[PDB]
Amino acid sequence: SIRSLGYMGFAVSDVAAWRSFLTQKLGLMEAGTTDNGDLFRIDSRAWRIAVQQGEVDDLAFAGYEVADAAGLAQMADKLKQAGIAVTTGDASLARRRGVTGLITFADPFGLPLEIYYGASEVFEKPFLPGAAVSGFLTGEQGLGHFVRCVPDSDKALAFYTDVLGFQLSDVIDMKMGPDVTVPAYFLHCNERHHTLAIAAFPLPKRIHHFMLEVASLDDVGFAFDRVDADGLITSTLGRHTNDHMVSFYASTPSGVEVEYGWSARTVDRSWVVVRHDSPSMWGHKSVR
Amino acid sequence: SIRSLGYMGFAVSDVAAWRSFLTQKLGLMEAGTTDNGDLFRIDSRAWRIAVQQGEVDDLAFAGYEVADAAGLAQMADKLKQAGIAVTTGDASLARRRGVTGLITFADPFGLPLEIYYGASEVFEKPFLPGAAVSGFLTGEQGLGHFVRCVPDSDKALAFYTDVLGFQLSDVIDMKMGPDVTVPAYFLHCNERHHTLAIAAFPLPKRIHHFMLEVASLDDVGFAFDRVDADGLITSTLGRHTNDHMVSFYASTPSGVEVEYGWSARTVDRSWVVVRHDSPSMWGHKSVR
Amino acid sequence: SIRSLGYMGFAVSDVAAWRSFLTQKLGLMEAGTTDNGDLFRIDSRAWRIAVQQGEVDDLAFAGYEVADAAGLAQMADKLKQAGIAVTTGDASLARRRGVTGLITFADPFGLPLEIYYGASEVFEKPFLPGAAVSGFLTGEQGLGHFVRCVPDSDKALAFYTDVLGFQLSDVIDMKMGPDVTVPAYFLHCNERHHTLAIAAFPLPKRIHHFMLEVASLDDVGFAFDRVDADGLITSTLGRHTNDHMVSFYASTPSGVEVEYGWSARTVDRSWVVVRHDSPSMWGHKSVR
Amino acid sequence: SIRSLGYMGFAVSDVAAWRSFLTQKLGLMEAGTTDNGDLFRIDSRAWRIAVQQGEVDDLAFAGYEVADAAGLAQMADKLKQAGIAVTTGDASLARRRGVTGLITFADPFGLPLEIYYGASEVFEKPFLPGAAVSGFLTGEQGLGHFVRCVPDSDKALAFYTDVLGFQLSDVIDMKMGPDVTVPAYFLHCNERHHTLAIAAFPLPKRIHHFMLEVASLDDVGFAFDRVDADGLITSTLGRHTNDHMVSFYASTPSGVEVEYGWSARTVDRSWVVVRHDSPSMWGHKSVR
Amino acid sequence: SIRSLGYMGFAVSDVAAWRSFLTQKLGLMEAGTTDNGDLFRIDSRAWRIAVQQGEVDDLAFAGYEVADAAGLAQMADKLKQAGIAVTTGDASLARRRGVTGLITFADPFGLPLEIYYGASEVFEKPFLPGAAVSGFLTGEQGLGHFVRCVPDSDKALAFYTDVLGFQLSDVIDMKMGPDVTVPAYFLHCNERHHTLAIAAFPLPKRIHHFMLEVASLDDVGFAFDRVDADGLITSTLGRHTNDHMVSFYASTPSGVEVEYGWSARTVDRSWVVVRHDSPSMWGHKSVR
Amino acid sequence: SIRSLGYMGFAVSDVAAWRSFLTQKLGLMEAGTTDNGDLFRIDSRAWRIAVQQGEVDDLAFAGYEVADAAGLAQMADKLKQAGIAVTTGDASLARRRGVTGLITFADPFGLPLEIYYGASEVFEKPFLPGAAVSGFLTGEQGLGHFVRCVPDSDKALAFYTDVLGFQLSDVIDMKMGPDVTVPAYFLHCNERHHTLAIAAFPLPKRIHHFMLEVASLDDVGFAFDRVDADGLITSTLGRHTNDHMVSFYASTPSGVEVEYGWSARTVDRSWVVVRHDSPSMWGHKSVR
Numbered sequence A, B, C, D, E, F: 001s002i003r004s005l006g007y008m009g010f011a012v013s014d015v016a017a018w019r020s021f022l023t024q025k026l027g028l029m030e031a032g033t034t035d036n037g038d039l040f041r042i043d044s045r046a047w048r049i050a051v052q053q054g055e056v057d058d059l060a061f062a063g064y065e066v067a068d069a070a071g072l073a074q075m076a077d078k079l080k081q082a083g084i085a086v087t088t089g090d091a092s093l094a095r096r097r098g099v100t101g102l103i104t105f106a107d108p109f110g111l112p113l114e115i116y117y118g119a120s121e122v123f124e125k126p127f128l129p130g131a132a133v134s135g136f137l138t139g140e141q142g143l144g145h146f147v148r149c150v151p152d153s154d155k156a157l158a159f160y161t162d163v164l165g166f167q168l169s170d171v172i173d174m175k176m177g178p179d180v181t182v183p184a185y186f187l188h189c190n191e192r193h194h195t196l197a198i199a200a201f202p203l204p205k206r207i208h209h210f211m212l213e214v215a216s217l218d219d220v221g222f223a224f225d226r227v228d229a230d231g232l233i234t235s236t237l238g239r240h241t242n243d244h245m246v247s248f249y250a251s252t253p254s255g256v257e258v259e260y261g262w263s264a265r266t267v268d269r270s271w272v273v274v275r276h277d278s279p280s281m282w283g284h285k286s287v288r
Ligand SMILES: Cc1cccc(O)c1O
Pocket: A172, A240, A241, A242, A243, A245, A259, A279
């Protein structure tokens, strides 16, 4: 069973811009360059984000973490039973990712996905942020979340819930103009309100944004000013209606957006599915 | 599985009297008028109580909340297997209620019931009470409770426990005169001591009272004076023997009573069924 | 310096009525009869209330406690310097009161007052209430409080503040009819909001009421029913505006009233004098 | 000794605009109109802000609170010894302000000031905000603070510290252009970081802004959107360097600004005076 | 000003019996033998109890601790002003005691007393008890207490309070037969209820007993059995009325008794002097 | 009155070695270079340590912080009354130090000392350590401490206690060989066990070491390895007997040592002077 989103990889046209953006604006730690690409850390794990040179300027792959080898076997089995083409990653790929075992496949719309177990910890190389950030929230909640843009939400929903096992948290009916309302589905696989959201938005990218969660309000406020100085803010500070995250959005060098937030609420056993008509309680004024 | 009582609707002869009673006396928030009727809020949900014009001057319907679409399916199945006529609410009714999906049916004695999932939240329109009330207790405990008057308690008990899944908390042997003792059964579907109580009382209404729980003793004390000013108190302040709620009772414009309380105890896994011979430890002097 | 109100004595016409009232209705502990009269306890002290046969049917004397012999000396000196006639209680009186040393005198309007130190504790005879009461709040706050009725508030105020050292907490302008508004002054000598209140009320007694504070809301609720059964309630449950005490008032066999409350707020160093136009936030409906 | 800022009065050209601004945008409670003007509440006190019709469109007077009559006497004495013309407010003014006693005078630059004791509490009329606000922080910290604009900071400083007794918290060197740096002095009279700030800013008003502190971040976020809707924001959300308050600034109908914040730090006994070169850690982008 | 009882020395006829008693029965740590005698520890201090060979079989001297050299000077001055013969301990005595400075003198009835400052700590030699004891309570409360038997309580009281500065906690009227009642005075110099008690008991020793306080009830229970095995118990387990200590008493090899207790209450600023007629709430049955 | 040690300045022969040592080994933040020298931060203050090129390779000056201008005046007065030559720092020096006001003078043995008030805070430039360090403990405890080597301890003691106002915490008799025992005196001016220690050690430097305190054990462990890699450790990890600090010592490029520790205990009002015969409970093995 998938426990969390463990890592993500981006294929970008300007690797240098990304390196500077992630470290100096967002405060991630530069962890070196390997055949896996430029590596960035936010906690004890050897890397959480990989940046590789590429033409797409988008998310290249995402890795979901299981607890152990048995969990990996279960997922591989579940995918095969669903008719999905799964490939047991070879030692070379496993070594490149720094994991113990992994399987590779793609979602219904071509996003390369990986499920793995036994990632590398580097407690001996204590995390030191590239900018003043008190800390990132990961742990059992994993890396954070991202919104997957799809041409067909129902097909995407079936794959992610029925095959991958994500559970629905809530739905937000996004009013995009008078004759257009698009439902965005928020899914969880652990306590984090959502690790994945699905929506049929008309965008040139695989994802609308990815999100990183920090430990204090000041982390967000300081990062906002750093990003604003270069005119990269896309949405002002605000708080979401569903996860209650206080955040701002900014544009990465690839056009893909990043959400930087704090204080999200978690999902518990007493959770019930609900619907909303607005994605924000306050703030989040679009300055795009 | 039913998680809680989510909403209630009243069909009354004097809608204006009700509007003034709920907002000015009890402190509910007016949430507008729709084809669902005059809507009132007590928390983040779009509405909890609906008031419609009608001749019965009584509870018109009650909606029980399940966690998701699977839960709705389970309940529909359970009802069908019991031989109950269930109707899958159409999009029009679902839209009118502001829910994602729902099924409709009636209890053995004609009370229209609805089981739904995916109600609407309105965090962007922060709750502001119509009178000075610090807050209402809902959350996982739902709306509150009501006492269903029935001609046959055993038939009602079987339906609510065996078909709807409520569990018995305790029983109170109500001494109504020398030759009459009527057992009142208190049932729960979550932590709240009881979400439903059943008793064969000789009343012209479907329910004896509905109850709303507030956050502080002062909320109760202030509301008591507001209600008393118009001579609407039916029972003085007292504390119940079973749920330990400190409350007073008052008459609504429909004759149906409302209980306004604070500090009830909850039911846990170690709970055991017991019986009582009195419904109150102290207070609750009838001034009817 | 006066630390608290330590004990009170009543001279009543019906000693038996008082004994039954204090133990069975209020829950005090009967502590035996001596030359000091029928003694009642509420904590570890040998006695807090003494009931003696007498014609006045009123408060006969009150004893204020100092910390030690030096404190007694200070107060005696302060009184003498003010021209008050003070009498050093003799060993016989000290033994009768169960104290180590004491001085006697009277307030400007004839109420016998005593200031003493070294009262008797009886931890070896654990307190057992005469009725179901979880506990009384005394400790550093002392016995409770009483309202002294006087013909001239200014003269009384000067004596109690300038000579006895009480400090003003707040004032309540009591509206007693269209052409009459009487200010009631509330004074403290420790954390308890007020140990003494002064008002020019037209009453045949030295005090309007004395107050005892209990540990839980249920103590108050149960006592209310016990007292109400005999038709002795004078004011329904309510909460005061100044000390925030939740209480009810009842008539004692002498006509003097008793206030039985819970949850009063205390006075701290940041306290500032304020004024109120009402003595109650809610409740306290006079049923006299 | 001055314990806090207790109330403020504004003389404005558009009373209706102010009424709507304070209740609907900021969430204050309308408390009626008297010869003291339109009254607004934020807590248990009968009024904290008074709005009167007037030509200045500015702060008309401010009242500082002492603990009691002795404190009032001390301050009156201190002012007289300093050669300040003090007037003992007459019963008519005291009644108009709803206080027990007060003295009136002016600061060195003509701002009418009042020092009083024994203000009116109205616990019987529970605070109900005009907009969704969880609460305002007052208590021992008083009303909030305001920045007094003066032509000569040193003269103002001497009066406020040496005569009124305020203590310096810190100084911020405000860089207003290449050839201009103006020191702003922040003073406290209790735990609140500053109740008064003094700066020689070139403004047509007596004060730059007044500040109200709320209980949660959401109170600030929601109010920001309410104010922004009418285009009244003057500074975006940010956090100050000295008091660590998270706030935004907005324009009132008089041009005078209001700061609405949350989470300020307090001053303790271990506090030491420091200096800063910036008034904000992050945010507070001027949108004037 | 005396801060606490720091150490005690005994002059006994059977040093070996004492060594075995203190370590094996009470659990003290043997700290070696010096010209100061056999040393025993109960905490970080180099020694708290010294046992020397001697004929008296009693307390030979007690040392009271001041905070520093200034405190020592104050006490020396206070004693001289009282006409007491004080001797500044020489370097040889100071070195023998392991202190920085000390003065010697005697109480009115010949008990050698010492007031010192700058005792030796031995954190590098961690405390290891001679028997299973979780810990001893010392710290700011010092060593414990002892009861000084005197022929004249009033003379002793004057010396200890007026000259040494101890403060009275309470008094217990000890009923020793029909025609004899002896008051025992309990004095404190810090939070410990009493560091010294004075009573005119007819005993051949300078003290009735000394007391050591342990950290848990089991420490007391286990020690009781160890002592009882040798038939040395003098009083069964019980709890005192004044300090609320749960303890038992036992005979030392010198006839002098030792009290071993747990859970005593402390004295605070709100403390007031009281009197008791019994020294125990329960237990403490004399088995002498 | 001196509140704490605020800053220190070093005059060294190899500024580059120091820059690398402080940032890379100890984790301080580089704060730029000014006419005050290379500046390093450990908290919100603009700088705490200044490194200037110089021949002495030692501590050049230390600055003690007072709360305000009045405190500065008091100290200046105290020094003058003692016959010490004090110089009111001019605006140029004040600006160079980034303080509001300061006075300069020297200790009896030539160490330049400064007492100042109103240092600069830079909350807008959040602290970011040069190495992985969770945080430094400063606040009311100030910078840390240093041991001043002197030829005459008694003369130094008189100056620091009688003139500067430091209070003695404790003394450690340092056994330096058979015929040599040197007392080291530890003094405090706030909660930190000692801000200054004085000892007549035969060293070529003004100070034996300065100490910086970090927030966690791992901060110390990681720094130890960083320093050990270059063979700079002088004492292994250990814990002191007096302040209970867990620390290691290392050599700076000037030969002067630095102590890096965690978990020291503080001094409270109940503190009493004591003596020790060892400076360490465990560890601190000299590897010099
Ligand atoms: C668009 C959107 C809506 C709700 C929560 C989110 O985190 C989000 O990005």
